[PDB]
Amino acid sequence: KDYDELLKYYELHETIGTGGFAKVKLACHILTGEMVAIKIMDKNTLLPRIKTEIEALKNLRHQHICQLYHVLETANKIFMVLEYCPGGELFDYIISQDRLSEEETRVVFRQIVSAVAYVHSQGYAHRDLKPENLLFDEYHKLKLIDFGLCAKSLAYAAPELIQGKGSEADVWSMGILLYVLMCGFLPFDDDNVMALYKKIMRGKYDVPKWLSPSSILLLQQMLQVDPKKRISMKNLLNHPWIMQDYNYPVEWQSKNPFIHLDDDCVTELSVHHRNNRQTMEDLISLWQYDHLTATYLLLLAKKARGKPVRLR
Numbered sequence: 001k002d003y004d005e006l007l008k009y010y011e012l013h014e015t016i017g018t019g020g021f022a023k024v025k026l027a028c029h030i031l032t033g034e035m036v037a038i039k040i041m042d043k044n045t046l047l048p049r050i051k052t053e054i055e056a057l058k059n060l061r062h063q064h065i066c067q068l069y070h071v072l073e074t075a076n077k078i079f080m081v082l083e084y085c086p087g088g089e090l091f092d093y094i095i096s097q098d099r100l101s102e103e104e105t106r107v108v109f110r111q112i113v114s115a116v117a118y119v120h121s122q123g124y125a126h127r128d129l130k131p132e133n134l135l136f137d138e139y140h141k142l143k144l145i146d147f148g149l150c151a152k153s154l155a156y157a158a159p160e161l162i163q164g165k166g167s168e169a170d171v172w173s174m175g176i177l178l179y180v181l182m183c184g185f186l187p188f189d190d191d192n193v194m195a196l197y198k199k200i201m202r203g204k205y206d207v208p209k210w211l212s213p214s215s216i217l218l219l220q221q222m223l224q225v226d227p228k229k230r231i232s233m234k235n236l237l238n239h240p241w242i243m244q245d246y247n248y249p250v251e252w253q254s255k256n257p258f259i260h261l262d263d264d265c266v267t268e269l270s271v272h273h274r275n276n277r278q279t280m281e282d283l284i285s286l287w288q289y290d291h292l293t294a295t296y297l298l299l300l301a302k303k304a305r306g307k308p309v310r311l312r
């Protein structure tokens with residue numbers, strides 16, 4: 001019924017995810033054959049957390065940020081078509097490994113820093129950074145996924161954010177996350193909501209015996225309860241610990257920002273549709289996030305993966 005529309009462009013598969021706001025299905029984009037993940041929201045039962053996520057993602061274009069391809073609103077649904085990340089949540093990857101060496105943690109964490117730092121460079125704060133919100137793509141690289149709370153879980157929430165006293169609070173979070181990567185459990189936890197608050201406000205947590213002193217100092221600079229004493233985003237990029245084994249700062253700028261429309265891609269579409277090239281060109285530049293945008297973008301994903309730009 002609400003599905004009549006989507007079923008035009010995609011073949012639906014199994015639910016691969018459930019959040020509090022959305023059910024998320026593996027689907028295949030019929031025209032290009034590419035796998036995608038679609039986030040399905042009931043407009044009735046919930047709030048405009050959605051308007052935020054979509055406003056955000058249309059403005060964030062980055063190798064570590066999940067790409068948005070297509071929005072469709074129905075009589076009752078909003079459907080969001082995203083880059084499919086077959087790797088699984090980062091949370092799930094810790095669970096199986098127990099915890100990560102510092103070397104692997106660096107590799108991973110530098111990608112979180114890249115994404116978050118680029119997010120801040122655009123004027124936003126994610127505000128809900130945590131492992132369940134970082135997914136591994138087909139290349140095993142991380143993609144950040146969940147932007148309902150982008151601004152222009154309580155265990156990850158900075159003490160000043162708990163207090164209502166945005167960017168520093170992402171550092172805090174990224175600090176809770178680094179802890180989780182290295183030790184494989186939360187720095188602060190408790191069955192009781194307010195007891196867990198107390199813990200977060202005290203900022204005192206276990207320091208496991210496998211952490212290198214560089215690690216432990218890092219944690220201590222990120223996990224400063226007082227925001228004003230917290231490592232700023234700027235020196236996180238080139239901290240000694242961050243640079244170990246790499247010796248350059250984190251590369252946070254977009255390696256693939258929007259410069260020109262793709263030469264080759266405009267062509268496969270005006271060829272497939274039998275449409276004047278120039279009208280095809282002109283209509284892509286509407287950036288509507290309709291099935292036209294989708295097909296275009298998904299054909300760039302073919303290019304970035306080194307696949308032929310072809311339509312079946």
Ligand SMILES: Nc1ncnc2c1ncn2[C@@H]1O[C@H](COP(=O)(O)OP(=O)(O)NP(=O)(O)O)[C@@H](O)[C@H]1O
Nearest residue numbers: 016017018019020021022024037082083084085146
């Ligand atoms: N791009 C994707 N590729 C593969 N799986 C995804 C993708 N986006 C979401 N999922 C899966 O489904 C879950 C729900 O997605 P998510 O955006 O977190 O849902 P949400 O309800 O809007 N927000 P939340 O309450 O914070 O979970 C995720 O944690 C993933 O496991």
